[PDB]
Amino acid sequence: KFPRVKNWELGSITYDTLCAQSQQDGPCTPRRCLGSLVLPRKLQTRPSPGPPPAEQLLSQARDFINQYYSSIKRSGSQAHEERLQEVEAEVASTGTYHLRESELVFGAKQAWRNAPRCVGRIQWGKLQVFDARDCSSAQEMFTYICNHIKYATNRGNLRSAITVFPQRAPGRGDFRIWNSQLVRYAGYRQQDGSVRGDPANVEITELCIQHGWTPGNGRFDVLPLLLQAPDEAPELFVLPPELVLEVPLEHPTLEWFAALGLRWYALPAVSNMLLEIGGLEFSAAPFSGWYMSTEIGTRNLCDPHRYNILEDVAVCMDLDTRTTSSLWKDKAAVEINLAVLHSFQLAKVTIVDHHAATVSFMKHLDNEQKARGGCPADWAWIVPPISGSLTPVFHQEMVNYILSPAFRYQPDPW
Amino acid sequence: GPKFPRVKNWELGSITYDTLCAQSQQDGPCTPRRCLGSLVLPRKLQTRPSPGPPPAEQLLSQARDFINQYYSSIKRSGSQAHEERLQEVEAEVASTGTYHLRESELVFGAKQAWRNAPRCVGRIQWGKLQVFDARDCSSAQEMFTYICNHIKYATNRGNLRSAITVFPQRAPGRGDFRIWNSQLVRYAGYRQQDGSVRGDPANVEITELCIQHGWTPGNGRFDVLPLLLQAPDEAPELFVLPPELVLEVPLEHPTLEWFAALGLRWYALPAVSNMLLEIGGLEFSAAPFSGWYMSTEIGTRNLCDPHRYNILEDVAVCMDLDTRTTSSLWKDKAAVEINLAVLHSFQLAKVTIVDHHAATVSFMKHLDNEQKARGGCPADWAWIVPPISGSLTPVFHQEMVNYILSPAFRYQPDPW
Numbered sequence: 001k002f003p004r005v006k007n008w009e010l011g012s013i014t015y016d017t018l019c020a021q022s023q024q025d026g027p028c029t030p031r032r033c034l035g036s037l038v039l040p041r042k043l044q045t046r047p048s049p050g051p052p053p054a055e056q057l058l059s060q061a062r063d064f065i066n067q068y069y070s071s072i073k074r075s076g077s078q079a080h081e082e083r084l085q086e087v088e089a090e091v092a093s094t095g096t097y098h099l100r101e102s103e104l105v106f107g108a109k110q111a112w113r114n115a116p117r118c119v120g121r122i123q124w125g126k127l128q129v130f131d132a133r134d135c136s137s138a139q140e141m142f143t144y145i146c147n148h149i150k151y152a153t154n155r156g157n158l159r160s161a162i163t164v165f166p167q168r169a170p171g172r173g174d175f176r177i178w179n180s181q182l183v184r185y186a187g188y189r190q191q192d193g194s195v196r197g198d199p200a201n202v203e204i205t206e207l208c209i210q211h212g213w214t215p216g217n218g219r220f221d222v223l224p225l226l227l228q229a230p231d232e233a234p235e236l237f238v239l240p241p242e243l244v245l246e247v248p249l250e251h252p253t254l255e256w257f258a259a260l261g262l263r264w265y266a267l268p269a270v271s272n273m274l275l276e277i278g279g280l281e282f283s284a285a286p287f288s289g290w291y292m293s294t295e296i297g298t299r300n301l302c303d304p305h306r307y308n309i310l311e312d313v314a315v316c317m318d319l320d321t322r323t324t325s326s327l328w329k330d331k332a333a334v335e336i337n338l339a340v341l342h343s344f345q346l347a348k349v350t351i352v353d354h355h356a357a358t359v360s361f362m363k364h365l366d367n368e369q370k371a372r373g374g375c376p377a378d379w380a381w382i383v384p385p386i387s388g389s390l391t392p393v394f395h396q397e398m399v400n401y402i403l404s405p406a407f408r409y410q411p412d413p414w
Numbered sequence: 415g416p417k418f419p420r421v422k423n424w425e426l427g428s429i430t431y432d433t434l435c436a437q438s439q440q441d442g443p444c445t446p447r448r449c450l451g452s453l454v455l456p457r458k459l460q461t462r463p464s465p466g467p468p469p470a471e472q473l474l475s476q477a478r479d480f481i482n483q484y485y486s487s488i489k490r491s492g493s494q495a496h497e498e499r500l501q502e503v504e505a506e507v508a509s510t511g512t513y514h515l516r517e518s519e520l521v522f523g524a525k526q527a528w529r530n531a532p533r534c535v536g537r538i539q540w541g542k543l544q545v546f547d548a549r550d551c552s553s554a555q556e557m558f559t560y561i562c563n564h565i566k567y568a569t570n571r572g573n574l575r576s577a578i579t580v581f582p583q584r585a586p587g588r589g590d591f592r593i594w595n596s597q598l599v600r601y602a603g604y605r606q607q608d609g610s611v612r613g614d615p616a617n618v619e620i621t622e623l624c625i626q627h628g629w630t631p632g633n634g635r636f637d638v639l640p641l642l643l644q645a646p647d648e649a650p651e652l653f654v655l656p657p658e659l660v661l662e663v664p665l666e667h668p669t670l671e672w673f674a675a676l677g678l679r680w681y682a683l684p685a686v687s688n689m690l691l692e693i694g695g696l697e698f699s700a701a702p703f704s705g706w707y708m709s710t711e712i713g714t715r716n717l718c719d720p721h722r723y724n725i726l727e728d729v730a731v732c733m734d735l736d737t738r739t740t741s742s743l744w745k746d747k748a749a750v751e752i753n754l755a756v757l758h759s760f761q762l763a764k765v766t767i768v769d770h771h772a773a774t775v776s777f778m779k780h781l782d783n784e785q786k787a788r789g790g791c792p793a794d795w796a797w798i799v800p801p802i803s804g805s806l807t808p809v810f811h812q813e814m815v816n817y818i819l820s821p822a823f824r825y826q827p828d829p830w
């Protein structure tokens with residue numbers, strides 16, 4: 001029952017017993033593995049059709065509370081017992097309950113700690129948690145987000161942070177941030193069927209313009225936010241330009257690289273995922289840490305369905321883009337990644353390369369093996385999108401499973 | 415919609431449903447509670463030398479399944495020849511406990527097994543496999559002859575041809591035919607006194623077994639290992655491959671003149687020789703197969719893995735890169751250059767080879783063919799995506815479903 005996990009670079013072996021704590025099913029079965037799929041058909045947090053079974057929720061709440069008191073070493077203590085009772089008293093009467101600030105803080109850190117696809121989990125203990133459950137309007141949501149952004153950015157010395165809006169409630173609309181990230185670039189669908197800017201944001205850019213936003217025509221126009229308070233049409237808010245730090249991309253040796261006019265924002269702030277803690281679901285809980293260079297230089301700038309800039313840089317590098325065998329693509333990608341690291345380091349903005357990051361993940365795996373006897377990880381997401389085997393995590397086998405607290409995907413609010 | 419896995423390609427936004435997985439009859443390592451898809455050796459397949467023949471019934475259904483696949487492949491399901499062959503196989507299992515395949519049936523299973531391999535990116539070539547039947551082989555010396563003919567035909571002076579040679583299946587109470595080497599062509603791993611390894615660290619054990627069985631070792635970094643072949647119930651015999659038969663490619667770089675001076679080289683024929691080929695319940699413990707190299711296997715894995723030749727730092731130093739800081743991406747730079755060197759040297763030498771870009775593209779095409787031909791294609795994402803430039807290839811953005819289908823190639827315990 002316990003998985004033997006091997007690292008083929010060092011011959012070392014470990015056993016993952018933590019996976020035994022998993023109480024939530026994944027998409028795989030013994031007949032076929034679906035671990036390569038990005039999203040589930042319906043593991044996904046399906047919009048509360050009504051109150052969840054009192055037993056089920058109460059069961060998840062007790063485990064969390066248990067987890068919490070173990071954390072502070074006062075397990076089995078009086079507070080623990082009395083806290084479990086408060087929880088039971090609330091579920092029985094109202095059909096739900098509420099977390100305490102410190103419990104929320106603990107829940108958030110555990111959600112990050114449990115995210116199988118995150119390579120930066122070594123930082124899991126350092127998370128600024130902003131309790132925004134005291135929010136009743138999209139306008140209030142906008143003030144919170146600005147504070148989170150201001151704090152998170154910290155003039156280029158990024159600090160990981162999350163902001164938690166009101167949990168979901170039976171029979172009422174969810175609080176939602178329509179944007180996938182707090183900061184993204186517009187995707188303008190032009191006449192020729194092509195797209196100016198970020199192709200992945202065509203739809204969202206649409207919805208914005210739909211709700212009265214005056215669009216630009218640049219390739220890097222920061223999108224406005226569509227904040228939605230319960231059962232109210234989402235509202236449009238423009239992010240103050242000075243709050244949104246950006247890094248102009250240039251190259252250490254290739255003088256012309258700058259002439260390309262490329263740039264990216266400093267703050268990677270996911271805002272479309274759901275945070276679940278002890279059965280409670282938080283539909284609006286944007287979080288952020290800092291970028292790993294490859295996400296910008298490889299995925300955002302080089303994915304075919306994104307800015308797809310490989311050929312341009314390749315032509316500017318005067319490379320034989322006539323045949324795959326010249327490895328022109330591989331050569332241009334390395335420089336694009338180098339430019340990002342160089343530029344971010346020049347703008348004195350926090351960033352981590354894929355080598356540094358995976359080395360740190362390896363250390364995290366060890367700390368977690370001793371701390372909990374295992375660590376859920378999704379190999380296809382931990383290994384960088386370039387130079388896979390060139391990093392240590394590639395040669396490290398991994399067990400993937402779902403632990404709670406957790407960050408989950410949810411339906412687009414439209 | 416459909417009660418089958420929904421698969422999506424995020425670059426093209428297209429969707430497909432894999433209904434082929436429904437035909438799987440072998441359980442994998444994953445469960446609804448945890449995914450063990452990233453494990454290299456899932457203790458599942460690992461055809462552990464079962465003491466006696468499979469339960470007459472376990473084998474029967476497997477065989478019945480294979481025969482059905484064969485007759486379908488020739489569009490004659492339910493035909494008189496089909497029910498007869500079914501009666502023929504059962505009758506045979508009834509009187510001997512096992513059975514034998516017809517020539518064409520073997521050819522069909524061999525191709526299907528390659529076709530079914532979830533970890534192989536070059537399956538678009540599956541239908542073009544030369545199957546050498548060597549089930550008449552009775553001695554280790556004869557195994558040597560076949561293997562040499564395989565290498566000769568397969569290498570074909572640089573214009574490589576995919577091939578597989580099938581030795582006698584496993585028989586009830588009677589030693590297995592085994593090739594101890596993991597590949598027909600591999601470099602020796604010489605244990606040093608300081609503790610390091612000269613050559614290929616991956617082969618220290620096999621090297622020390624050749625020596626103990628009489629091999630007179632060399633002391634180079636690229637010494638070709640002799641073959642340790644094993645006939646049924648006999649101790650393994652050693653055989654040295656005639657140098658002229660082992661084509662190799664010295665490596666050089668198109669623009670970095672000093673690269674050649676590194677004295678690096680690699681062999682042209684990749685021939686896995688330690689896998690078990692299973693067809694309709696029958697087990698072929700010795701059945702080496704070969705095709706041709708995808709450049710990254712040589713340039714990235716063999717030459718750059720830290721536990722292999724680990725040549726990344728040397729090349730980087732020669733390139734005058736800052737190996738003192740990760741942010742200089744010196745590993746990425748050296749790897750690209752080493753990989754280009756492999757592609758350049760093979761082409762110059764006129765030896766078949768394929769870069770990860772062309773290969774992955776052909777695989778996408780292959781996925782399209784199988785979607786229409788079988789309703790899906792079992793694929794191991796972590797193995798289809800190349801070890802470098804992952805998201806720069808089309809397969810990275812293609813979700814995949816992994817499952818076991820037989821015929822198949824399975825890992826097997828080492829004979830010693």
Ligand code: HEM
Pocket residue numbers: 112115117118119120121123127160161162287288289290291292295352357381382407
């Ligand atoms: C400190 C800096 C951090 C770095 C360098 C980092 C880096 C990454 C990377 C590279 C990915 C995978 C992206 C991909 O392969 O497509 C990822 C995913 C993820 N990270 Fe982190 N992370 C950091 C902080 C955080 C924080 C603060 C949280 C949460 C509080 C977090 C939550 C997650 C989650 C939930 C995922 C998966 C999202 C998805 O499924 O799309 N990360 N992270």
Ligand code: HEM
Pocket residue numbers: 528531533534535536537539543576577578703704705706707708711768773797798823
């Ligand atoms: C046409 C040329 C071929 C190319 C370029 C090719 C390429 C590859 C590559 C890149 C791998 C995975 C390497 C890795 O990630 O470690 C692989 C695995 C595999 N290939 Fe192919 N292949 C070819 C022909 C063949 C043939 C002829 C057979 C069998 C008849 C075959 C059977 C397999 C199997 C069973 C595996 C998995 C081995 C394992 O699990 O370690 N391949 N192939």
Ligand SMILES: N=C(N)n1cc2cccc([N+](=O)[O-])c2n1
Pocket residue numbers: 007008379394395396397452453454796797798
């Ligand atoms: N392409 C491959 N051969 N590999 C795919 C893999 C997936 C997980 C771990 C691996 N390790 O450890 O090597 C691995 N190698």
Ligand SMILES: N=C(N)n1cc2cccc([N+](=O)[O-])c2n1
Pocket residue numbers: 036037038380381382423424795810811812813814
């Ligand atoms: N690290 C990642 N973001 N990804 C890991 C993956 C595994 C399979 C398919 C993917 N697609 O299609 O994007 C994928 N992306």
Ligand SMILES: O=[N+]([O-])c1cccc2cn[nH]c12
Pocket residue numbers: 268269270287288289290291292295
């Ligand atoms: O690449 N990243 O830095 C990255 C990707 C995805 C999510 C987060 C959160 N902080 N950084 C992240």
Ligand SMILES: O=[N+]([O-])c1cccc2cn[nH]c12
Pocket residue numbers: 684685686703704705706707708711
């Ligand atoms: O990389 N390869 O080319 C490769 C790897 C493993 C097996 C075979 C068989 N032909 N080519 C192969």
Ligand SMILES: [Zn+2]
Pocket residue numbers: 028032033034035444445448449450451
């Ligand atoms: Zn799985």
